[PDB]
Design a protein around this nucleic acid. Sequence first.
RNA 1: UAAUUGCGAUAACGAACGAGACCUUAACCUACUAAAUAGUGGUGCUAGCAUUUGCUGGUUAUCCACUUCUUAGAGGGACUAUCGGUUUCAAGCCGAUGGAAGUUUGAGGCAAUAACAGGUCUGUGAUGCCCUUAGACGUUCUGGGCCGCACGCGCGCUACACUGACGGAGCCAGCGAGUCUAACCUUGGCCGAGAGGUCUUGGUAAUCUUGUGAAACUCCGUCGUGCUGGGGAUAGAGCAUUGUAAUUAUUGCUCUUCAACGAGGAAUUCCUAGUAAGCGCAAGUCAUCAGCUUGCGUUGAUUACGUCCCUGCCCUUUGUACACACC
Lengths: 199, 145, 137, 67, 63, 100, 70, 143, 52
Amino acid sequence: FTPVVLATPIPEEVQQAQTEIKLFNKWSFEEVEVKDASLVDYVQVRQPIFVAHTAGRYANKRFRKAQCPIIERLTNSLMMNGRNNGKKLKAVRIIKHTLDIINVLTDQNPIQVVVDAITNTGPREDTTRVRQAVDVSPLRRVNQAIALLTIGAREAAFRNIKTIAETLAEELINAAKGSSTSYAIKKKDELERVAKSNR
Amino acid sequence: SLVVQEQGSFQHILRLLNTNVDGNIKIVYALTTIKGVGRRYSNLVCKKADVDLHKRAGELTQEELERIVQIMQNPTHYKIPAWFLNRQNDITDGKDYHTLANNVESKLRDDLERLKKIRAHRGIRHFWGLRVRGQHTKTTGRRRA
Amino acid sequence: VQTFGKKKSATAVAHVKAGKGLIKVNGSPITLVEPEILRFKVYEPLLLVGLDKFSNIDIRVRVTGGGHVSQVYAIRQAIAKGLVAYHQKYVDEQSKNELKKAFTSYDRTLLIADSRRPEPKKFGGKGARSRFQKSYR
Amino acid sequence: GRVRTKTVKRASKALIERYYPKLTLDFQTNKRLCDEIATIQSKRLRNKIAGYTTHLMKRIQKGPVRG
Amino acid sequence: TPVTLAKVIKVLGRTGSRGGVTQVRVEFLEDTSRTIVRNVKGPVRENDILVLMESEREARRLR
Amino acid sequence: IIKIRITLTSTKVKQLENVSSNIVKNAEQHNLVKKGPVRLPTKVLKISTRKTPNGEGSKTWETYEMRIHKRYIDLEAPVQIVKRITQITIEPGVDVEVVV
Amino acid sequence: AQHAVILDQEKYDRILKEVPTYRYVSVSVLVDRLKIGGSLARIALRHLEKEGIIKPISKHSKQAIYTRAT
Amino acid sequence: PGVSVRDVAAQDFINAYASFLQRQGKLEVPGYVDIVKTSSGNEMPPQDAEGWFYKRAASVARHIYMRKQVGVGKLNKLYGGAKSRGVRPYKHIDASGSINRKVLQALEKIGIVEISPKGGRRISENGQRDLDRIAAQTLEEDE
Amino acid sequence: NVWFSHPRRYGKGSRQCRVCSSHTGLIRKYGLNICRQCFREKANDIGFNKFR
RNA sequence: UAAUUGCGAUAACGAACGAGACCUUAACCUACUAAAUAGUGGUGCUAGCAUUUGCUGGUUAUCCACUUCUUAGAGGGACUAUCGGUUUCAAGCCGAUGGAAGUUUGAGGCAAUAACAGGUCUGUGAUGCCCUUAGACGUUCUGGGCCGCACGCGCGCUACACUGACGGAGCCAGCGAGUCUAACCUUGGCCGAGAGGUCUUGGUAAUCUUGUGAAACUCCGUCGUGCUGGGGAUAGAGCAUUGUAAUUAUUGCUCUUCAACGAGGAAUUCCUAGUAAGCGCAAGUCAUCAGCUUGCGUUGAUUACGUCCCUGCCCUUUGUACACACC
Ligand SMILES: [Mg+2]
Ligand SMILES: [Mg+2]
Ligand SMILES: [Zn+2]
């Protein structure tokens, strides 16, 4: 299918980006849909990116943070514990390895898997210290979902054999499938439990 | 890597120069249990004896163990520089050893005892239990117990 | 024919000349920028506009002055600006406009240099804003 | 905030009070004649005065304003 | 678990002692002819969508 | 003719550029060829010190600056005219060094 | 020396028939699935990729990403 | 087909040039192997004793190829990293000057790198030849 | 005569402020050799000015 | 509104200081000027690879052209521009587009009436008064002390490990400093395992140190989750450097023991974008000595775009038997 070649010898696996439907270096990007209808316009798949390193100004304004690619948002949220401040190359390599593990296990378009996981672990209701049950906006839902997922992956990869990428993969898989065996879902239902007791 | 079945030649925790060496880790770091040999001394010994550093003491050998012991007790003759040893120009002979036994503690207490017997400041500080290398005792190492 | 690219402090000078698709970064091909993860970040301005699309031009960049990521962004934008300027000068103007629109619809500072500069540090604390820890008692 | 001080607002007001059959509601041509009809001692202040004069001229055509 | 969702049409203003909550007037997407005022923790703009497990509770100001 | 390099150095930019232009014009009215006046980067001799003459108060630092601006103009001329060019430069504050 | 230090000899059976019942295999997965201690995991994982049933997904280092071959 | 040293950048080229240094038979080793850490800022010797000197020589030769004359001080700065100074913050320390100098002398005795008219050492004619042959072989092995 | 001079070629006792003779707070940058207070006093007089 | 910033209301009107304006710096400018103290194109010098001339290489007295990179003078540019919505009447605010830059464009310098018994007589050959002034409280020399250790507190550095440690490889900045009355930054060669030692060289400086071949970082390996290969406290031996003089180890280096520490209670600090944080570098103190400071640059988040719940401050109202003004 149009195997064009260049004077610089490079594999055609990189030229295969735009010859057909645009997609990641490895993963299709068009077949992503949020399973809910509320968190739309805050997950920013499509626009697609070639790698989760879009170093763009996303903090000058209030709501520009929402249009950042969600893969880069999770890559950024991996950049914690102080020691791993910075090291965006490390974070994006971890994200690549995690997408690969989600591909190996019930692939389901791993970027779509993480989208579904974030939507399923975004807390729909919280409590404010007045303790009154208030609602949660989609932006807070997305940021809290990403924070819970990365924190669970962080404290699962902490002091154990399995690497950060696979702890992240198993956390995101359990959040996408909506099982209460993982940290993000457990803490989301913990936050949602005090909704009838705080009204 | 290969077949290491060795149903009868496998070694559990073993005895080497008066202390117990764990056969479940590579020989270089297994040797570091001996009080007197550290990371680089063990690394030098285990490959001066040309033994495989990628395998543990549990499968290493039975004779190269004693060869490693000998290369440790007599490093100077067997092509090892003086500066690599922990006790050179010891106190009274000028020739260099490397104390590898339950004897490095004995030589340390010997140095402390001769310092205290000759009434040097360092020996006096060691007798009192205070810091001896010019540290500030005002705020650090208070409990020390 | 000669464009530049900067991200924070790195500057990459791009020379675009009549040639046959030679994309050199420091004398090596574009396949040897070697952060091993931003190689696609240097591939962006090719796969954006045209897969090869270019048997008539040669791009030779030289980058210095920043850090690894700053240089990677500097070349990834210098080569795009060189392509735009080449189409502006020689090839065609509607072609230049279409290719610039294709660049901007994916813009990752491929065409406009990032304006963020390091804020000067002020006394009383490490960094421009963070202050030394203060104790009352 | 982008609030304009006295030295901008009063200068723009006077510029309108004496140069109405003059500079239109475009800032580019509003700042040009400021150099010849006013001795401003800094280009930033000149730009501020010209911008406020442009704003006042753009809002004068939709109802007279005070002063 | 009953299903219900709505969209904020008008954000009234900040509320709470420290100002962490916002009062928003929400319109139910199904049965659009009903407006209810609710409290939201996160940032909110217009034409935004909220999921509220509880459906009919007029959230009051939070002193 | 003699090829030389005149170096002008000072902290006053206006006074230094005055001679850096006077030399050029005095070589133009005599119709010489010169490699145009090169502007070497201004050296900021910034020096940070403590505002307090004692040890009390908020730790407030203040930096002074001395901007040394240097320029160099290289040309050729015979002795009788090069001496006139090196005697026109009497601007207070700017030091002028001629090298053959 | 908590489990499966160097020997893994009595339990040869499912070191070949291990890709069934779990698709993912890695230097840490071998540790996780109660068979071999990770002291030899990164050197045992080279055997099956040189010849066997696990196909590598990339040139990953400090981690392994392998799949069952169809 | 017009292959230079700049067609494989970082790792495959060194891992092949060191293999050529094995094939050549000339060890050129000063015997410091098994004794040196390669830097005062290090804490362990190289993990493989046979091979580290060949890799150092390969990378040194490639480094001198890629640029103009390079001296032992520049090699010390290049190959010296950060030092764990204990409870103190890490600091850069220059690499082993004797090791770098002896590697350069070995490359001199091989004729791949020669003295420079302004100081340091520039890659020589047969040095360029050998480096480019290794680059071509590496390309044909894996592009 | 042979006891009234301990050698002071180096150290904080070797140099003094050229104005006030203090051995503390000395500024030896650019060869100023002025105490950090006397330099603050006579800073504009030397050519050092505050801009930022 | 950041602002007594302005709109507006109105016995006020018109103004002044402060704020702002201003100045410095960091952003852009294929526009002007000029650059073997900056760089890029090609000619001969043409070593490599490939061989229809192509890649990268190299030529500090080797040619021509120029200023895209760099430098710095003169200027330009932003004034929230345009367009919507919100304003009560506007000042303004909020979005989108354009723009290099739309949060005072970012950051500083300067900064009114004044108040403190705030600190400094240990900066001043600034100083009133008091004390001393030849067994001196002057000055100098020797030695010690300022560091001294049941203990409490504060600023910090290193950690508790795999998002890691170690070993090889990749080799990427910026702000700066540097000796002619003489010893500074040091390139290169040589010796040494290391620190370091020796012979020269370049630099009074956009020239040389220096392209500061910084670190974090990236790649490939070893490690396999253990008081372990995390961690480097404590101590011993030996080797050098600086210093007239290293003992109470100045510092560096090699070996050797490998202490607590498994993420830290009550409390508590800083911080809103190239910012926090991580990371190192230069300068200052310097004969030597960083875990300190002042700046610089590398990687670059999370969250928020509000409020008076706490704290502090300001304004207004009010009480006063205060006015030396609650000491
Ligand atoms: Mg003290
Ligand atoms: Mg200090
Ligand atoms: Zn003084």
